[PDB]
Structure formats: structure tokens, C-alpha cells
Design a protein around this ligand. Sequence first.
Ligand SMILES: *C(=C)[C@@H]1/C(=C/C2=NC(=C\c3[nH]c(/C=C4\NC(=O)C(C=C)=C4C)c(C)c3CCC(=O)O)/C(CCC(=O)O)=C2C)NC(=O)[C@@H]1C
Ligand SMILES: *C(=C)[C@@H]1/C(=C/C2=NC(=C\c3[nH]c(/C=C4\NC(=O)C(C=C)=C4C)c(C)c3CCC(=O)O)/C(CCC(=O)O)=C2C)NC(=O)[C@@H]1C
Ligand SMILES: *C(=C)[C@@H]1/C(=C/C2=NC(=C\c3[nH]c(/C=C4\NC(=O)C(C=C)=C4C)c(C)c3CCC(=O)O)/C(CCC(=O)O)=C2C)NC(=O)[C@@H]1C
Ligand SMILES: *C(=C)[C@@H]1/C(=C/C2=NC(=C\c3[nH]c(/C=C4\NC(=O)C(C=C)=C4C)c(C)c3CCC(=O)O)/C(CCC(=O)O)=C2C)NC(=O)[C@@H]1C
Lengths: 151, 161, 147, 145
Amino acid sequence: AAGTMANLDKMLNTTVTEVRKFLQADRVCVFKFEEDYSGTVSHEAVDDRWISILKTQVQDRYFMETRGEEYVHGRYQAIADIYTANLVECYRDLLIEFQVRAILAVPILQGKKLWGLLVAHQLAGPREWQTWEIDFLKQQAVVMGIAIQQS
Amino acid sequence: SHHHHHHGRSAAGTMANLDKMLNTTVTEVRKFLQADRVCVFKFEEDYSGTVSHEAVDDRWISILKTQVQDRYFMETRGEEYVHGRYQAIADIYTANLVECYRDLLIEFQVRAILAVPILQGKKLWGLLVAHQLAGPREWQTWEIDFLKQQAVVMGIAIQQS
Amino acid sequence: MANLDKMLNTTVTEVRKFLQADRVCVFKFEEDYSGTVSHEAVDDRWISILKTQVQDRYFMETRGEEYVHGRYQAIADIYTANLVECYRDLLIEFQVRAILAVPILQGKKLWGLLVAHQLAGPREWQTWEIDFLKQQAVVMGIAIQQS
Amino acid sequence: NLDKMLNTTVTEVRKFLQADRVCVFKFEEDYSGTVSHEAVDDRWISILKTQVQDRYFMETRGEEYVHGRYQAIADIYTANLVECYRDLLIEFQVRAILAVPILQGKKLWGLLVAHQLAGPREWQTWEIDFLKQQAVVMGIAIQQS
Ligand SMILES: *C(=C)[C@@H]1/C(=C/C2=NC(=C\c3[nH]c(/C=C4\NC(=O)C(C=C)=C4C)c(C)c3CCC(=O)O)/C(CCC(=O)O)=C2C)NC(=O)[C@@H]1C
Ligand SMILES: *C(=C)[C@@H]1/C(=C/C2=NC(=C\c3[nH]c(/C=C4\NC(=O)C(C=C)=C4C)c(C)c3CCC(=O)O)/C(CCC(=O)O)=C2C)NC(=O)[C@@H]1C
Ligand SMILES: *C(=C)[C@@H]1/C(=C/C2=NC(=C\c3[nH]c(/C=C4\NC(=O)C(C=C)=C4C)c(C)c3CCC(=O)O)/C(CCC(=O)O)=C2C)NC(=O)[C@@H]1C
Ligand SMILES: *C(=C)[C@@H]1/C(=C/C2=NC(=C\c3[nH]c(/C=C4\NC(=O)C(C=C)=C4C)c(C)c3CCC(=O)O)/C(CCC(=O)O)=C2C)NC(=O)[C@@H]1C
């Protein structure tokens, strides 16, 4: 089993790098949840021009109160412009600290449990996420799920 | 011999085809879930809408044809519902809701509500809604998944009609 | 149980009308992956196969494992497909020309198939129709898992 | 560049599944094909650019594969295979083969294939799922290029 965790860590790191290149996003990361649905940016591919947010811990009220239940039942986040969208102010402030203009966040499941998020950020400017891109990030999060379960 | 897709859709009588299918679906979903009401809320271009299809236990007042000017939908144009948001409330009396929305639900005799999006391509077309009117109802995870999956098939039927 | 069975009989009836198929049926597997036509909507022009029991070698040998991993059947014209002769003769006995069959899953189990037949003639199943019958089978699966 | 992306994927899939070879078999108009992309352990022959005229695929135009058919063979010596097919695999040093379809919209564009070359291999249900889900993501990449 040693080192299958290093093998998963290499695999998730390669995946976020290829997804960021393919979608031409500024940042792609994995947000991994703890037991209480706080979490940490576990994996990040970021264009050198921008803040690396790797290992930033986030205590998000929405995830910690719902324990991600809506994301197990098909809710996800597609925001073209964080200024446009009616976000709770402190959540918008967190995204601005991350330099975020646009965000796409889809779930990574283990069975019936939310393990984490796969997240694309546009940092340069607003971005209208297309149907195929949302579908692509969701399908990549399924690949990640299978890999995580089997390591 | 080869099956052709004409399907007699040039007939004025086939306008009500989609309405008949949707009426059968809400009737059968109400019985299967043993809900007091199942209805379709159809949106207009400004994301006001109407209760377009309803199955309701005859005890309760019919809300069929009720027009609703919902601030959340009219302000968002249903963008969060296009991206999979839904409502699943066991007890609307105890829930943290805006009071004017609670009052609308109370006027509909609602104690519990499960409301999921219906899409037509990339557009929010409507909501599929189950109500418990007799008393509160803890909606199960499988019932949320059920009603979402029923709305997927209804979205296909709306697209292909 | 009556409530589930009514939902299933209504479903094959409505699916048959919507797709303009000649037959729509549920094939329910037994423990040996033999099966029964358990639910059927058919035009009166054609023979009812409701309650027919089928001992299909492909299903009995695989126990439907390929169907749990995304294989399904979409045949426009059984007379031009390259079918095992004893399966083609079963389909001929059912007056089949075109067949679309998708799995009904109960968790990880292949519980059955949701099946559309064209009997009048061949039929090129469209991508949307395949996706539609798969999504209707997911509705049926969710219900059967909870009844 | 799509070819860079497909090469990265077969390379990382091969490492993750610990296969001896992962490649893409890309179909021509007549459902002949060529290995277009290959990650192989240097111990074994490279089959990159090999053109194959496959009787099953050219006759069926891979319709069963458009509809989810796949091949999971633990041991090509103890599999009920047409000898000219078992002979194509032996030529490639294959012992075990997992092959799943790659779709471009509704067309069968190619296959994503894992070979074990060292010895036989009991493919696991999760691996069939993993490789099919890689093929889904590839299909989307291919369609949008
Ligand atoms: C104020 C109390 C803040 C707070 C509470 C809320 N957060 C909310 C939504 C939320 N949080 C996330 C998490 C991330 N997105 C990312 O890119 C990263 C880093 C990669 C993280 C950690 C998402 C995706 C969402 C939206 C979920 C959804 O679909 O609703 C909300 C409710 C929604 C809103 O109005 O914003 C509240 C309230 N979070 C904070 O961090 C501070 C403490
Ligand atoms: C006050 C101005 C009222 C109002 C505005 C709001 N609607 C809100 C949310 C909402 N609306 C619906 C709609 C329905 N539920 C149904 O059963 C039917 C009919 C069958 C309809 C049309 C839903 C499902 C939701 C929940 C949205 C969500 O957040 O997921 C809200 C905010 C919600 C809250 O916090 O309570 C407001 C404000 N609607 C009115 O008609 C009056 C004018
Ligand atoms: C010979 C031994 C016969 C036999 C065996 C085989 N069946 C095969 C495939 C198969 N069977 C089914 C079942 C149905 N089709 C229906 O309409 C209904 C009723 C509504 C049933 C029960 C399906 C869907 C398939 C196709 C599976 C696939 O995708 O391959 C096969 C191999 C397939 C082939 O022909 O190439 C064999 C062999 N069935 C019999 O009853 C006799 C005994
Ligand atoms: C004889 C004429 C040979 C031949 C014909 C056949 N091919 C058959 C099936 C088939 N072909 C493939 C293709 C590949 N597998 C690979 O690893 C690669 C390269 C990376 C290729 C191109 C697969 C996966 C299958 C199996 C299909 C299935 O699921 O059945 C068959 C019949 C299959 C059987 O044995 O049942 C014949 C006959 N191909 C040749 O090139 C020679 C000339």
C-alpha cells in the first residue's frame, strides 16, 4: 500500500494540471472536506501570475451546516461573475481574497458521501461556463472519485 | 416499413399531448409518494409562473391556474435551479424562510414541500413540486433523487413535444 | 407493492405512447437470470408476451454483469444484425423487428430490462430516445429500490 | 494540443492501473484503425502507428460498442476467440486486454485499451468503470477539439 497515497497524490496533481490547460482556466484545485465539512485546498494547478492557495483551510458556513447534502443530490456552483451573483457577502470576500472572478465547483463523491470539490476559477475576468465544460468538470470529478475510492 | 417521426404532430389535437402526459405523471407521482399534492409550476419569460398541472387529494383546495410572481425566481431567473438547487422542507412553519414566501405556502395549505427544477435544454422551464398538506413530512434522500429523476424525464418530454 | 406495480404499468403504457413503439415491456430477472415479461403495453395488432418466461444463455451465463457496466441493446433490424440464431428465433417469436433494451438497476443488481420493440418494421433508435429510455429505467430503479 | 493531452492520459492511466500498455486505437471511415497513442513499458514492443483491419469492427462499424459493449479478457489463451484475433493479440505480446469505446457524439471514434503483457490479469469491476469513465472524458476532449 506504501506508496499508493503518493501515487494518488501524483495522479490528482496531473489531473488538475491537464484540466487547467484544457479549459484554459487560471486555477483548478481540489477542496477536500474534513469530518465537520471544513476543508483544505489539497491539490492546485495555478498559472504562475496568481496567488497559490494550496493548503488554505476554509470553514465555509454553507458546507458546515448542510454537510454537503445538496451537493450529493445534484446541486453545484456555476458563477460567471462573483459580483453579479447574489452571494452572501463573507463568501464573496473569500473568493476575492482568492482573486476569483468566475467559479465552477462540482462534487467529488465516495458512495453517498461528499468527499470534496473539483473547482475551476477564472481570475483574469468573468467567464460564462458552457454546458460542455460543466459536463467535463463533473465527469473528471467522477474519475477522481474512482481513483480516491480504490487507493 | 421504416419508422418515421411524423407521429401525427400536424394535428391541432396534439397540442394537449404534452399537457396529457404531464397530468398523468403528476397523478402517478402523487399516488406513488402518497403526497397530498403534486404539481408543475411553469415559468413565463420574466420568471413569474402559473400552476399549469396539478394532482391533489379532493379534500384540499385546488391551486391549478394560480399565478405567482416569486421574487427569488424573478430576481435570479432560476440560475441556481439551472445548476441543481432544489427545496426540501419537512415543516414550513419551523423553517427559516422569508415570511411572504411562508404565507404563499400557507395559502396552499402546505406543511412540507419538495420542489425540483425542470429544464428545457439550458433553460429553467418549471418546477416539479410535491406538497404534504395534512402535516409535516421528513423527505427521504431517495424521494429527493426520485423527484429529480422524474423532472429529468419530464424535461426530455417537453423538449421532444 | 400494488402502488409500485401500478406505477410500472402506467410507465410502460406512457413510454409506449410517447415513443410510438409497438410494445414496451419490463423483463424481470429471477435469481438464475432467467426472466419474465412482468409488465407490458402492446398494440392489440400484435401478440401479448406478458408472463412469457425466457431462459436466455447470454443473461444466464453473464448474470447481466456487462449491463451493470453500461452495455445495452439497440438493434434497428434483427434480420440484418449478427445475432446468435436461438436469440434471433426468440425475437422472431415475439414479432420483433427492432429492439432497444436498457438495464433497470436496484443498487448494483441488474433487476431487469426496460424494453421497446418495433414490430411493424425496422427502426433506427435516435440518441435522444436511447437517453430517454435509460432515464426512465433510472426512475423505475429508484422506485423498485424503495418498495 | 489534443495529441499531447491523449499521450498524457494513456501515460497516467498506465501508471495508475499498473498496466504494461495503455493505448488509443483510432478508427478510419471503414472502421479500420491505427494505434494513434501508446504508453508502453520499454520491456515490450511499441505498437504505435500499427494499422489494423479488424473484421468484427469493419463488418459491424462497431455498433455494439456505440451501445456500451466492451472487452475484458483475463487470459487471451483461455478465452473463446477467433484464432486470427487471438493471433493479432499474440503479435502484440498481449496476455490480458481491457478495451472500452471512445465516442465522438454518437459515433464510435476509437477504443481506449489496457494490455497486461507480463502475465494474465483478472480485470476488476472498478477498473472496467475507471477505463470507461476515462473514455467519457477523452470523448468530450476529442469533440471540443
Ligand atoms: C460567511 C459566513 C462565509 C461563508 C459562509 C457561506 N459560504 C457559502 C457558500 C459556498 N462556499 C463554497 C466553497 C469554496 N469555493 C471555492 O473555490 C473554494 C476554494 C477552492 C471553497 C472553499 C462554495 C462552492 C459555495 C457555494 C455553495 C452553493 O452552491 O451554495 C454560503 C451560501 C451561498 C452564498 O450565498 O454564498 C454561506 C452563507 N463561507 C466562508 O468562508 C465565510 C466564513
Ligand atoms: C414575497 C415577496 C413572496 C415571494 C418571494 C420569494 N420566493 C422565494 C423562494 C421560492 N419560491 C418558490 C416557488 C414555489 N413553491 C411552490 O410550491 C410553488 C407553487 C407550486 C411556487 C411557485 C420556491 C420553490 C422557493 C425556494 C427557493 C430556494 O431558496 O430554493 C423567496 C426566498 C426563499 C426563502 O428564503 O424563503 C422569496 C423572498 N413569492 C411570492 O409570491 C410573494 C410575493
Ligand atoms: C440460445 C441459447 C437462446 C438464448 C441465448 C442468448 N441470448 C442472447 C442475448 C440477449 N437476450 C436478451 C433478452 C431479451 N430481449 C427481449 O425482448 C426480451 C423480452 C422482452 C428478453 C428477455 C437481450 C436484451 C440480449 C442482448 C444482450 C446483448 O447486448 O448481447 C445471446 C448473445 C447475444 C447475441 O445474439 O449475439 C445468446 C447466446 N436465448 C434464448 O431464449 C435461447 C435459449
Ligand atoms: C481476423 C480476420 C482478424 C481480425 C478480425 C476480428 N476482430 C475481432 C474483434 C475485436 N477486434 C478488436 C480490436 C483490437 N484490440 C486491440 O488491442 C487493438 C489494438 C490496440 C485492436 C485494433 C477488439 C477489442 C475485438 C473484440 C470485440 C468483441 O468484444 O468481441 C473478431 C471477433 C471477436 C471475437 O473473437 O469474438 C474478428 C473475427 N482482426 C484482425 O486484424 C485479423 C485480420
